[PDB]
Amino acid sequence: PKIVVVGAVAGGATCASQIRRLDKESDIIIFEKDRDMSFANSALPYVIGEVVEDRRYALAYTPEKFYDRKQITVKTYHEVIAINDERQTVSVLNRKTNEQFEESYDKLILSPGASANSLGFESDITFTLRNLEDTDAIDQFIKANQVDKVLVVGAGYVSLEVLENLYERGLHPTLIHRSDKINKLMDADMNQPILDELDKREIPYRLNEEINAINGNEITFKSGKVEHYDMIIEGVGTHPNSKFIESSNIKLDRKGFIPVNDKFETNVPNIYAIGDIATSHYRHVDLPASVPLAWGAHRAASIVAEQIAGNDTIEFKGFLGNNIVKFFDYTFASVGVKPNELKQFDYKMVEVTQGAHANYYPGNSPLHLRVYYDTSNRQILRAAAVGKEGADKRIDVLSMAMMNQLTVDELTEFEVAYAPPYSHPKDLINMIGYKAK
Amino acid sequence: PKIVVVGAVAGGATCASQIRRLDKESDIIIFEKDRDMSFANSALPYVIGEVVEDRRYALAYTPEKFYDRKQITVKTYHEVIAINDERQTVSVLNRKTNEQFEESYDKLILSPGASANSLGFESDITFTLRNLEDTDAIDQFIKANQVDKVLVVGAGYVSLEVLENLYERGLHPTLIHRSDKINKLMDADMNQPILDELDKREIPYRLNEEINAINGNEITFKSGKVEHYDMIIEGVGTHPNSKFIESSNIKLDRKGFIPVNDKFETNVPNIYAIGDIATSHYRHVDLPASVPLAWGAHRAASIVAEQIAGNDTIEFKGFLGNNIVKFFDYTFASVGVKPNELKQFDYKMVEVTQGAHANYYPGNSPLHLRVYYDTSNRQILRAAAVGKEGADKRIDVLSMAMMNQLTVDELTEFEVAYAPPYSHPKDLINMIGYKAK
Numbered sequence: 001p002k003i004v005v006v007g008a009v010a011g012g013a014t015c016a017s018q019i020r021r022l023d024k025e026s027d028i029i030i031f032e033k034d035r036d037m038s039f040a041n042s043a044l045p046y047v048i049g050e051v052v053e054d055r056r057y058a059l060a061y062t063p064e065k066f067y068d069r070k071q072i073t074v075k076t077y078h079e080v081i082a083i084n085d086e087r088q089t090v091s092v093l094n095r096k097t098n099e100q101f102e103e104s105y106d107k108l109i110l111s112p113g114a115s116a117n118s119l120g121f122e123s124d125i126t127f128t129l130r131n132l133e134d135t136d137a138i139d140q141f142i143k144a145n146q147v148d149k150v151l152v153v154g155a156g157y158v159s160l161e162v163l164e165n166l167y168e169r170g171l172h173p174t175l176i177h178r179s180d181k182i183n184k185l186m187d188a189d190m191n192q193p194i195l196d197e198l199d200k201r202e203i204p205y206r207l208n209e210e211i212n213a214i215n216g217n218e219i220t221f222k223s224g225k226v227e228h229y230d231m232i233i234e235g236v237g238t239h240p241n242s243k244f245i246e247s248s249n250i251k252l253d254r255k256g257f258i259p260v261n262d263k264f265e266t267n268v269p270n271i272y273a274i275g276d277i278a279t280s281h282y283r284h285v286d287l288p289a290s291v292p293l294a295w296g297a298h299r300a301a302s303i304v305a306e307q308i309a310g311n312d313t314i315e316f317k318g319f320l321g322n323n324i325v326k327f328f329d330y331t332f333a334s335v336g337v338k339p340n341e342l343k344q345f346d347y348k349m350v351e352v353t354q355g356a357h358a359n360y361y362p363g364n365s366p367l368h369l370r371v372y373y374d375t376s377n378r379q380i381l382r383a384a385a386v387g388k389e390g391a392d393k394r395i396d397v398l399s400m401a402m403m404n405q406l407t408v409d410e411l412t413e414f415e416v417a418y419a420p421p422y423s424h425p426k427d428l429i430n431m432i433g434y435k436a437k
Numbered sequence: 438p439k440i441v442v443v444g445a446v447a448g449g450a451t452c453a454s455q456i457r458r459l460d461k462e463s464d465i466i467i468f469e470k471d472r473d474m475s476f477a478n479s480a481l482p483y484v485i486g487e488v489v490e491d492r493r494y495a496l497a498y499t500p501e502k503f504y505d506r507k508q509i510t511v512k513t514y515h516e517v518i519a520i521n522d523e524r525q526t527v528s529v530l531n532r533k534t535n536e537q538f539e540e541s542y543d544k545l546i547l548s549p550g551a552s553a554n555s556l557g558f559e560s561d562i563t564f565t566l567r568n569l570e571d572t573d574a575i576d577q578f579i580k581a582n583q584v585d586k587v588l589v590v591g592a593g594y595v596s597l598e599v600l601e602n603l604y605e606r607g608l609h610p611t612l613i614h615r616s617d618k619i620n621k622l623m624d625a626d627m628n629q630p631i632l633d634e635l636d637k638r639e640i641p642y643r644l645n646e647e648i649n650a651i652n653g654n655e656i657t658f659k660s661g662k663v664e665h666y667d668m669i670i671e672g673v674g675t676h677p678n679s680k681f682i683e684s685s686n687i688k689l690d691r692k693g694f695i696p697v698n699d700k701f702e703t704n705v706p707n708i709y710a711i712g713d714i715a716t717s718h719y720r721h722v723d724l725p726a727s728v729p730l731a732w733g734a735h736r737a738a739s740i741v742a743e744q745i746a747g748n749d750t751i752e753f754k755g756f757l758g759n760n761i762v763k764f765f766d767y768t769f770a771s772v773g774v775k776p777n778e779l780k781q782f783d784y785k786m787v788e789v790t791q792g793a794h795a796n797y798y799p800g801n802s803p804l805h806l807r808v809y810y811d812t813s814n815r816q817i818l819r820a821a822a823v824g825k826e827g828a829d830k831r832i833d834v835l836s837m838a839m840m841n842q843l844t845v846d847e848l849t850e851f852e853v854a855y856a857p858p859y860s861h862p863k864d865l866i867n868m869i870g871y872k873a874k
């Protein structure tokens with residue numbers, strides 16, 4: 001079938017590649033509105049911190065390379081501006097010429113993702129981060145202005161990674177956030193180490209703080225404070241890239257995302273939507289979910305490839321929402337329903353704080369693991385772990401347990417890999433099970 | 438009931454403590470033939486290495502402390518020499534006075550463990566490592582003789598830990614083993630990094646090599662080589678401590694272990710066996726299993742405590758044989774049936790080697806993950822992982838998958854915690870699922 005993919009990055013290039021693995025005959029074209037395909041979105045903060053030095057590390061492919069290797073055509077600086085879904089074509093603006101044309105399809109895959117929000121100030125010193133053009137502009141500006149003091153606005157996990165990288169590069173960031181709900185995928189009492197790590201490094205922060213006005217480099221804040229900053233990086237949320245879809249028959253929710261079934265189909269035949277634009281449901285509970293992270297983009301890209309060109313019985317089973325961030329010496333990881341969704345259930349909480357590994361073994365640190373379960377059926381609803389060591393291991397185990405709607409009591413039965421450097425004969429996970437009675 | 442426990446360490450002291458948590462009235466007496474109770478067995482190689490130097494980590498209690506805390510009587514230097522099951526007593530030898538006496542019981546719990554094998558040479562410089570008296574004797578002999586050159590015999594995970602520790606202490610060990618089958622819980626072609634780590638550090642080794650004769654410090658070998666060593670530590674396997682059980686009605690297998698049901702009962706009413714002495718079955722396949730490791734001793738201790746004084750519906754579900762060892766910069770872990778047991782199934786193998794975390798992100802190291810699955814039902818039989826980073830995490834997640842009867846194909850659905858320090862958007866585990874078929 002002739003395949004048109006919109007977006008050439010985490011969902012779209014992956015989906016196209018997966019289809020080509022299954023099907024060597026079909027014509028596949030991807031349209032990408034910006035300069036680069038297949039950049040490593042998650043590497044971008046580390047490119048700013050110069051922790052990833054070789055900036056080609058964050059760019060897997062050029063169009064010429066993709067055609068050479070996979071016989072897939074990728075057109076950059078080509079923005080899909082309308083879907084003419086009844087005629088099965090898309091309208092495409094060639095952004096270099098400002099001429100538009102239609103591209104026909106038998107199957108359309110929409111992976112256009114999300115764009116950064118802006119606070120909307122008229123300011124040359126403010127930047128957002130979503131692609132490699134942005135990473136380049138930020139790096140350029142730091143060098144051209146010898147940036148030292150940088151205001152980081154927003155306290156979500158990417159803004160935090162940007163802050164850390166700026167600090168390691170030698171700059172002096174201050175963090176602000178409009179509320180006290182920092183790193184909101186993690187339980188709010190368990191985010192305290194973020195604020196400790198900032199305090200330990202004397203990196204200033206102010207929560208429930210916002211920009212009121214910008215006059216050149218002089219920033220006035222809601223608190224009444226006035227400070228000079230050489231550069232501002234705004235991490236103030238994202239919005240779905242669906243304006244080009246509104247005129248078509250595809251159903252959007254009230255926020256502009258595309259609800260999909262378990263085959264990533266939209267309500268319109270022959271159109272699929274994957275990645276951050278798609279909304280689905282949890283695997284382990286009957287609630288809607290949106291989980292705009294890399295794993296879901298790559299997983300949906302594979303399921304859609306199977307749907308189109310492989311085994312059409314392969315269908316998504318829903319999300320668990322496994323997520324994680326590093327901030328300085330700590331890891332913060334959670335999975336399951338979000339904090340604010342716990343109230344849809346009758347639930348209890350169990351938690352342990354114990355050494356990541358045997359206490360006498362050096363380099364130990366306290367790991368805090370918390371699990372919420374549903375009192376009607378003992379099923380695990382959510383887990384969270386924070387520590388210098390071992391958080392990602394416990395959370396990945398519990399994601400595997402929730403995939404199987406395992407109960408909290410069955411955690412006593414989990415058979416850990418135990419030697420002194422790694423865990424305890426009764427691992428933290430087992431202790432949750434023992435403590436749940 | 439009146440409770441007698443034989444062995445006061447990983448299974449026996451734990452079990453007695455767990456009973457006391459549930460039942461504050463029963464009399465509970467533990468007999469231990471050696472000097473110490475509740476030593477940390479897995480800490481021992483690290484004690485020898487001066488990695489663990491605080492005594493309070495090597496030894497958790499004395500009998501007087503245990504009594505004061507838990508009103509459990511522990512008689513060290515008391516060796517049970519017969520089990521008089523028809524009269525419900527044990528015959529005990531007080532090794533201090535060399536007098537024996539009968540002790541009556543209502544419930545008897547056998548946790549005698551295993552003893553180290555010896556090569557049988559008449560040698561003042563040769564030591565085995567099983568307990569804290571052993572550990573003290575080795576540390577004292579190094580100090581009394583200004584030991585520099587130590588021969589480590591055997592290549593099991595305990596000999597390998599002892600080798601690493603003697604090296605970190607500043608001594609000069611050489612490793613030998615009778616064959617090339619080193620570290621045999623791991624797939625024989627995934628142990629090369631043990632030899633690479635020995636070479637990198639210029640620590641000599643010889644395989645297919647044995648001690649042929651000893652004359653003082655002059656050791657003559659099977660190869661014909663003749664060398665001088667200051668000390669020898671022999672790690673040439675263990676044998677079950679069951680010769681004292683053989684006159685009783687308790688059924689032993691031909692290898693001298695005690696088979697038990699899922700309540701850890703023996704064939705004799707009111708007698709339980711737990712820890713290294715006990716044999717049971719795999720959880721995920723219908724085959725016998727013995728897994729002489731700390732998790733099993735601790736989980737059996739809990740189940741027995743429930744049987745006697747708590748919820749007697751709690752039963753064992755079988756072993757998976759999760760196991761792990763550190764050797765210098767590498768981790769070696771595996772779970773499921775042993776390599777020799779794979780031939781009892783029609784199976785296939787799938788593997789992947791990939792960075793532990795994102796390709797672009799620094800500090801990376803390749804992680805080799807291998808999965809065997811049953812072709813009759815696509816169930817996972819065995820998994821094994823070796824790498825500097827992330828092998829513990831992948832093997833615990835697969836331990837949890839095997840607990841939940843996951844097929845290899847379902848591993849594409851595992852939702853990993855992804856950010857660049859931790860994994861990839863399709864983790865190694867997901868790659869095994871995609872590469873299967």
Ligand SMILES: Cc1cc2nc3c(=O)[nH]c(=O)nc-3n(C[C@H](O)[C@H](O)[C@H](O)COP(=O)(O)OP(=O)(O)OC[C@H]3O[C@@H](n4cnc5c(N)ncnc54)[C@H](O)[C@@H]3O)c2cc1C
Nearest residue numbers: 007009010011033041080112113275276292293294297856
């Ligand atoms: C800085 C940063 C760090 C992140 N870190 C992590 C992390 O550690 N872990 C994690 O799991 N996720 C992380 N993410 C999120 C992850 O990158 C996304 O979930 C993933 O990119 C979703 O894939 P997608 O295909 O939907 O969107 P994208 O990868 O963003 O690709 C969408 C593409 O579509 C193009 N497009 C949009 N509209 C059109 C149109 N009309 N015509 C042509 N092209 C169009 C866009 O230009 C864009 O290139 C991070 C994201 C960022 C920005």
Ligand SMILES: Cc1cc2nc3c(=O)[nH]c(=O)nc-3n(C[C@H](O)[C@H](O)[C@H](O)COP(=O)(O)OP(=O)(O)OC[C@H]3O[C@@H](n4cnc5c(N)ncnc54)[C@H](O)[C@@H]3O)c2cc1C
Nearest residue numbers: 419444446447448470478479517549550712713729730731
């Ligand atoms: C050096 C070393 C390192 C290890 N490292 C690991 C590791 O990293 N991970 C892991 O999981 N496991 C490790 N193990 C194994 C783990 O310690 C054993 O699986 C666990 O100790 C088994 O508990 P048990 O109660 O059966 O035996 P033990 O803990 O050995 O206790 C048995 C006790 O019974 C006593 N006893 C025997 N017979 C009698 C008798 N007739 N009368 C009175 N008392 C008697 C013995 O003297 C002994 O003290 C290690 C073991 C050693 C020796």
Ligand SMILES: [Cl-]
Nearest residue numbers: 040041042043
């Ligand atoms: Cl990435």
Ligand SMILES: [Cl-]
Nearest residue numbers: 084085086087
């Ligand atoms: Cl149309």
Ligand SMILES: [Cl-]
Nearest residue numbers: 477478479480
């Ligand atoms: Cl231990």
Ligand SMILES: [Cl-]
Nearest residue numbers: 521522523524
């Ligand atoms: Cl008798």
Ligand SMILES: [Mg+2]
Nearest residue numbers: 083084247248
């Ligand atoms: Mg139209």
Ligand SMILES: [Mg+2]
Nearest residue numbers: 263265269270
């Ligand atoms: Mg259909």
